Write a protein that binds this DNA or RNA. Structure first.
Lengths: 601, 263, 44
DNA sequence: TATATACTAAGAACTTCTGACTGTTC
DNA sequence: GTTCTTAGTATATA
DNA sequence: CAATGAAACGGAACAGTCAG
C-alpha cells in the first residue's frame, strides 16, 4: 500500500546527486548511483515483501527529468524562476539579489548558472529544513504542473511556497535543476539506463515510459525476452546519419538502393486500432487532439479512415507530416505562416514505413518487406495521405543526379536507405542516410556579414558572450564606407570556444550597453534587440552558412537565416567589406530564398 | 501618493506566555494593554478612514491557521475594510475571563520565530487586491531579544526584515513594558525606522479621536487666465469644509436591508 | 410546532446561541420581526 | 421669515485592447 | 462607466 | 591515441498570458 519514496527523504537524493556531480570520474559517478539504487531496492524489498506498482520512477523521473512524460510542462524556466523567487522571497525588486537572479547570465565565477546564483542568494536567506521525501517532492511538482495547466498562477505560487520554505538551499538548488530539466550530472543517460538494467535503454527506445521501464525492469536479473514496438506506445523513431557521397555505394554494401526526397515537415507516428487512432511526435508527445482519435474528429483521421483496406484493423505508421495546398497541388514547407500540429490548406500525411499490421510485428523485417506492406495496406488519397515513393538506384552518379534534382526543385535533400535494413529505433544511421546541399563544400552561397550585437552566454558558455546580433550594410557612395546597418539574424554556433574567447577578448573594450529608448544611429534594430552593441568600425566580419532566407518579423531586413552558423571569422576582411541590402536581395531572389542553387559535379 | 490607494495597518502581538500573564503588579497587563491599544486604534479608524485596511494576527500561539499552514501563527482577522463584526471579535478577548478564553482557544504561547512571523505578515499584504498607499506593520512584544539561543533564526530575521524594508513595507514596534529588557539596540536597531520601559509612541494610539480626512485632491481645476491670451493652470483646493454628519441610509424596518428609494 | 406561527417575534439579545434562537423559533414558525415595528408587540 | 435636513442633481476621479514574454517546440 | 463629491434645491417650524 | 557517439545548445517558430 505504501511506497519507498515516502520513506526516502529528498535530502538523500540531493546528497547522491551532489556526490555524482562532484565526482571527476565515470566510475565514481557510477558507484555513487550504485549505492543509491542498491539501498533503494533493499528498502523496496523490505517494505513490500509480497502485487506491486511502486518502482524507481519517483526518483528516476527526477534524476532524468528531460524524459518526464506523465507530468505536464511546468511553464516555468529561469525567468519566472527568478521572478517567483523574488516575489515569494519578497526580495527588493531593485536589490542586488533580485537583479542577479533576473540577469544570471551577466557576470557580477558562476555567471550563467542559475543554480549557483540562486543557491548563493538563498544560502543565508533560508536555512530551511525538515526532510521532504521523494513523493512529497513529486506531489508538489505535480501540483505545480496541474496548476499551470489549470491556469492558476496563485496555486503555482502556493505550491512553490511550500517547496521553498520546507526545503534547504542545496535541495532547492536541485529542485530548480529538476524544474529546468537539466542536472549537469556529467553522466550520460545511456549510462543510467545500463545502470538500471541491461534492457532499460532498449525498453525505453520503444516505450518512452519511465514508469513502464521501472515497473517491468525492477529486478536487475530478470530480463525481457522480446522487446519490440507495441501499439499506442510511443517509440523513438530511427534517424539518418550524414552520408559520404564519395563512399555512398560502399556505405550501402555495394548493392542496389533507394533514393528519395527529404520532406520538410514534422516527424509523426500513427497508431490505429479500427476507429481509435493515436499520434506521437518525434519526442513522444501526443497530438491526437489535433490529428483525430476517431474518424469523426481531427484534421486528418476523417480524411484517412477510409484510405485503409477493409482488413486493416491494427496499424502503426511512421511518416512525415506536411501541409498540403489544395489550389496549387503542392506542399508548403514547414516554417512560416502555419503550424501543422495546430491548424485554406489541408492536412496531409505521407508515410514511409510501417511497424505493425494486425498480428505481425514489422520492426525486424527488411525495409523492402515493410515497403511492400505499405504499398498494399492502404490506398493513397492525394493531399490527405500518400505513400512516400522510394526510387531505385545503384550508382553514386544517380545519387548526385537526385541531389541536383532536389536542388533544382528547391527541396531540402534526399533520403537514401538500405533495402535490407531493419527498423532500429533511436539509431542514427544503421541503414538510413541523409544528404543535403549544405553537406557539400562549395555548393553553398555563404554570407559575410558584420557583428553588431552581443549577448551573454549560459551553461558551459557562461561568463562570456556566446552569441551575437548580425547586420547588413547600406550601399555607400563610391569611395565611402557604410554608416547604417540593418540586422539580419542571430548566430552563436560554428566557432570553437577558443575562437569565441579570442573574439571576446578582442571585442571586449568596444561593447556598449544597449538602450531601447536610445538606440545607436549606425545600428537600427527590428523587434529583436541585443544586450550590448558595438560600433561597426570596431566589429568583425563573420562568414555565415545557413539553409535558406525565410521571412521574419524580428529583423528589419524583412527576413532571417534558417539554420545559421559561423563558418569562418573573416579576419582578412574589413568591417566596411560587409555585404549590402542589394546583395541580400539578390541572394534572396536567386532561388526563391533558397541559398543552395548550384549543382554538384 | 496615488489617491485610490489606501492605508493598511496590520497588528501583530506576542502571544507567548511571556506577556500573556506578566502582570508584575495588579494595575495593568501587557496583553490587556496591547489589545486595548488595538481596539482603540481600530475603533478610531472606523470613523476616521473607513476606506482603509486593518488586520490582526498573533504569533507564537499553539493552535494554528494562516495562508501557508505554518507553526504558531494565528491570523485572527484578515486584511479587510474595518467593521463592527471585528470590533466584537477583539472585544471578546478584553478581560481576565477574556484572557482565559484566548489561552484555552489558541494557546499558552509556544515557540516562535519572527522570521516566519514577518513571512506571514508579508503574505497578508500581498494577498489583498486594492492598491495600498502606505503599508505599516505594528509589532506588540517586549522580548527585546527575540532569541539569543539560535543565531541562525536571528540571521534569517535580519534578512527577511531587510527584504520587507525593500518590498515597500515599513515595520514598527512600540516597546510596551518589561522588567529590565527595555532596549532597542538589542536586535531591533536594524529593524525599525534613547529608551525606557514604556513607549510614548503607544500612548498617542489611545488618543481616541473621531476625525475624518480626505487626501490631496482638487475641488476643481480651472485655468486662470491673466488676459485673453495668457492662461495658467490653477487647482482650486479646499482647506476648510464644515463636515456634516454622514448621510443616513434608509433601511427596511425589519430586514435591515437597503430600500433603494424610487421617487 | 404549528403553534408559534402567526405570532410575531423580535429576538434581539440572547448571546445562548443568539442566531439559533430565531432558528429555534423558525422551526416553531414564529413570525420573526427581526426589527420591531408597531405590528409586533413582544420583543425578547 | 428664519434655519435644518433631505434630496437630488451634477462633476470629477476612479476602467475601457494592445504588446510583449515564455515558454514550448523543433 | 462607477463612485464619488458637492450644492443647492428643496421642505418644515415660531 | 584516436574515431565514434551524446549531449548539450542554439536558435525558430508558435500563443497564451499578463501588463498596461
Amino acid at each position: 500500500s505504501q511506497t519507498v519514496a515516502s520513506h526516502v527523504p529528498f535530502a538523500d537524493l540531493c546528497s547522491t546527486l551532489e556526490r555524482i556531480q562532484k565526482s571527476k570520474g565515470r566510475a565514481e559517478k557510477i558507484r555513487h548511483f550504485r549505492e543509491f539504487l542498491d539501498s533503494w531496492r533493499k528498502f523496496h524489498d523490505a517494505l513490500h515483501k509480497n502485487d506491486v506498482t511502486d518502482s524507481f520512477y519517483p526518483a528516476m523521473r527526477l534524476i532524468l527529468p528531460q524524459l518526464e512524460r506523465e507530468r505536464m510542462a511546468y511553464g516555468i524556466k529561469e525567468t519566472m524562476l527568478a521572478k517567483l523567487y523574488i516575489e515569494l522571497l519578497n526580495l527588493p525588486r531593485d536589490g542586488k539579489d533580485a537583479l542577479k537572479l533576473l540577469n544570471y547570465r551577466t557576470p557580477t565565477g558562476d555567471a550563467g548558472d542559475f543554480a549557483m546564483i540562486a543557491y548563493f542568494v538563498l544560502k543565508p536567506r533560508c536555512l530551511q529544513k525538515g526532510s521532504l521525501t521523494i513523493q512529497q517532492v513529486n506531489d508538489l511538482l505535480d501540483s505545480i504542473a496541474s496548476n499551470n495547466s489549470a491556469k492558476r498562477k496563485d496555486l503555482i505560487k502556493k505550491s512553490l511556497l511550500q517547496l521553498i520554505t520546507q526545503s534547504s538551499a542545496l535541495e532547492q538548488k536541485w529542485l530548480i535543476r529538476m524544474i529546468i530539466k537539466d542536472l549537469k550530472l556529467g553522466v550520460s543517460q545511456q549510462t543510467i539506463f545500463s545502470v538500471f538494467h541491461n534492457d532499460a535503454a532498449e525498453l525505453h527506445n520503444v516505450t518512452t515510459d519511465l514508469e513502464k521501464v521501472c515497473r517491468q525492469l525492477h529486478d536487475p536479473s530478470v530480463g525481457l525476452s522480446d522487446i519490440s514496438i507495441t501499439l499506442f506506445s510511443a517509440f523513438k523513431p530511427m534517424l539518418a546519419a550524414i552520408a559520404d557521397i564519395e563512399h555512398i555505394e560502399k556505405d550501402m554494401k555495394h548493392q542496389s538502393f533507394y533514393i528519395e526526397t527529404k520532406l520538410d515537415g514534422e516527424r509523426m507516428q500513427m497508431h490505429k486500432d479500427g476507429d481509435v487512432y493515436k499520434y506521437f511526435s518525434r519526442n513522444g508527445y501526443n497530438y491526437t487532439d489535433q490529428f483525430g482519435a476517431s474518424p469523426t474528429e481531427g484534421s486528418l483521421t476523417p480524411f484517412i479512415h477510409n484510405a485503409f483496406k477493409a482488413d486493416i484493423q491494427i496499424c502503426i505508421l511512421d511518416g512525415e507530416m506536411m501541409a498540403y495546398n489544395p489550389n496549387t497541388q503542392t506542399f508548403m514547407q514547414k516554417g512560416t505562416k502555419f503550424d501543422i500540429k495546430r491548424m485554406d490548406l489541408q492536412t496531409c500525411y505521407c508515410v514511409f514505413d510501417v511497424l505493425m499490421v494486425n498480428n505481425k510485428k514489422l520492426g525486424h523485417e527488411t525495409l523492402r518487406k515493410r515497403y511492400e506492406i505499405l504499398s498494399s495496406i492502404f490506398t493513397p488519397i492525394p493531399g490527405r495521405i500518400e505513400i512516400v515513393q522510394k526510387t531505385q538506384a545503384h550508382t553514386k552518379n544517380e545519387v548526385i543526379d537526385a541531389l541536383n534534382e532536389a536542388i533544382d526543385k528547391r527541396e531540402e535533400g534526399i533520403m537514401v536507405k538500405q533495402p535490407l535494413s531493419i527498423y532500429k529505433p533511436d539509431k542514427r544511421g544503421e541503414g538510413w542516410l541523409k544528404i543535403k546541399p549544405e553537406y557539400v563544400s562549395g555548393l553553398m552561397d555563404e554570407l559575410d556579414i558584420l557583428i553588431v550585437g552581443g549577448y551573454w552566454g549560459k551553461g558551459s558558455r557562461g561568463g562570456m558572450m556566446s552569441h551575437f546580433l548580425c547586420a547588413v550594410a547600406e550601399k555607400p557612395p563610391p569611395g565611402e564606407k557604410p554608416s547604417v546597418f540593418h540586422t539580419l539574424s542571430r548566430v552563436g554556433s560554428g566557432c570553437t570556444m577558443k575562437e569565441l574567447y579570442d573574439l571576446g577578448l578582442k571585442l571586449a573594450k568596444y561593447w556598449k550597453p544597449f538602450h531601447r529608448k536610445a538606440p545607436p544611429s549606425s545600428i537600427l534594430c527590428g523587434t529583436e534587440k541585443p544586450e550590448v552593441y558595438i560600433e561597426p568600425c570596431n566589429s568583425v566580419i563573420v562568414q555565415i552558412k545557413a539553409a535558406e532566407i525565410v521571412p521574419s518579423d524580428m529583423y528589419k531586413t524583412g527576413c532571417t537565416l534558417r539554420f545559421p552558423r559561423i563558418e569562418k571569422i573573416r579576419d582578412d576582411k574589413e568591417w566596411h567589406e560587409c555585404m549590402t541590402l542589394d546583395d541580400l536581395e539578390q541572394l534572396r531572389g536567386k532561388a526563391s530564398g533558397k541559398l543552395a542553387s548550384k549543382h554538384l559535379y | 501618493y496615488k489617491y485610490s490607494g489606501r492605508d493598511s495597518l496590520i497588528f501583530l502581538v506576542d502571544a507567548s506566555k511571556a506577556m500573556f500573564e506578566s502582570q508584575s503588579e495588579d494595575e495593568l497587563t501587557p496583553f490587556d494593554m496591547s489589545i486595548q491599544c488595538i481596539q482603540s486604534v481600530y475603533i478610531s479608524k472606523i470613523i476616521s478612514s473607513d476606506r482603509d485596511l486593518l488586520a490582526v494576527v498573533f504569533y507564537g500561539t499553539e493552535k494554528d491557521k494562516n495562508s501557508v499552514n505554518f507553526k504558531n501563527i494565528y491570523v485572527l482577522q484578515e486584511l479587510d475594510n474595518p467593521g463592527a463584526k471585528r470590533i466584537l471579535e477583539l472585544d471578546q478577548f478584553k478581560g481576565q475571563q477574556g484572557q482565559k478564553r484566548f489561552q484555552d482557544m489558541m494557546g499558552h504561547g509556544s515557540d516562535y520565530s519572527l522570521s516566519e512571523v514577518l513571512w506571514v505578515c508579508a503574505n497578508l499584504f500581498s494577498d489583498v487586491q486594492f492598491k495600498m498607499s502606505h503599508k505599516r506593520i505594528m509589532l506588540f512584544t517586549n522580548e527585546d531579544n527575540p532569541h539569543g539561543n539560535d543565531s541562525a533564526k536571528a540571521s534569517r530575521a535580519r534578512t527577511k526584515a531587510g527584504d520587507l524594508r525593500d518590498t515597500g513595507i515599513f515595520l514598527d514596534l512600540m516597546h510596551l513594558k518589561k522588567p529590565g529588557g527595555f532596549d532597542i539596540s538589542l536586535f531591533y536597531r536594524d529593524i525599525i525606522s534613547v529608551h525606557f520601559e514604556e513607549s510614548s509612541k503607544l500612548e498617542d494610539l489611545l488618543r481616541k479621536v473621531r476625525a475624518k480626512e480626505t487626501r490631496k485632491r482638487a475641488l476643481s481645476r480651472l485655468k486662470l487666465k491673466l488676459n485673453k491670451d495668457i492662461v495658467i493652470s490653477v487647482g482650486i483646493y479646499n482647506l476648510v469644509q464644515k463636515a456634516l454628519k454622514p448621510p443616513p441610509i434608509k433601511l427596511y424596518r425589519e430586514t435591515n436591508e437597503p430600500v433603494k428609494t424610487k421617487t | 410546532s404549528n403553534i408559534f406561527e402567526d405570532v410575531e417575534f423580535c429576538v434581539m439579545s440572547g448571546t445562548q446561541p443568539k442566531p439559533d434562537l430565531e432558528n429555534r423559533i423558525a422551526e416553531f414558525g414564529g413570525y420573526i420581526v427581526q426589527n420591531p415595528g408597531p405590528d409586533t408587540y413582544c420583543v425578547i
